[PDB]
From Swiss-Prot:
Name of the featured protein: Heat shock protein HSP 90-alpha
Processing and modification events after translation: ISGylated. S-nitrosylated; negatively regulates the ATPase activity and the activation of eNOS by HSP90AA1.
Major subcellular site: nucleus
N6-acetyllysine carried by residues: 43, 69
Full protein: residues contained: 16 to 224 of 732
Sequence positions that bind ATP: 36, 78, 97, 123
Amino acid sequence: EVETFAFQAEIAQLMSLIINTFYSNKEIFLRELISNSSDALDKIRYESLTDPSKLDSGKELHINLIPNKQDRTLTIVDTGIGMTKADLINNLGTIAKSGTKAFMEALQAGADISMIGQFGVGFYSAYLVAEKVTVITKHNDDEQYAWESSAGGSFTVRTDTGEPMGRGTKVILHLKEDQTEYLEERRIKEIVKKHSQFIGYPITLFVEK
Ligand SMILES: CN1CCN(S(=O)(=O)c2ccccc2-c2ccc3nc(N)nc(C(=O)N4Cc5ccccc5C4)c3c2)CC1
């Protein structure tokens, strides 16, 4: 049902440094997940040019940001390309490996954490604000999958037999107790305007009631 896997040692190291380093500019995680979402949105927009059948699983290309005070989650939804089980288990780790090691070196050298994006590993910035990250994803040529990790060296991958999303990805951030500021409407807006005002898809913030 659920499979557990170790992260690439370097991604594990990176994650450990994200959690155990005193860094007050935690807001960067949102620019990174939106930029990832945008990248994944570009991929499907492009694949669809060659083959328009790739939008049968959803024609709209957008990012939604959903804060939820009750569950204390900030969910970043996108209708991008989404991930295969292969991407979740093998590809993502392998493609992050070199960027992770460069980032590790940059940090020891003196580089700021905000620099993580430039090494293609901005996703793991989620762990500055999240105690657990749950990613639901669905790619046209694969089933829906739930990827979950609270760091500590491992992640789990399972078929998500919940509500089907069509195509795309939800990164569900189980925010730390001290990091609920990212659930505030005015705060999400501030970060989006300041960091990623140049994303070529509509970013809708869902107002909680
Ligand atoms: C810098 N990144 C370069 C690569 N991509 S990509 O081109 O889309 C891509 C190319 C190959 C294989 C897959 C993807 C792909 C597709 C859709 C994606 N959608 C979202 N929302 N996020 C990501 C993402 O980067 N991560 C990182 C990560 C790490 C652990 C667990 C989960 C995740 C999710 C996505 C990645 C995203 C931008």
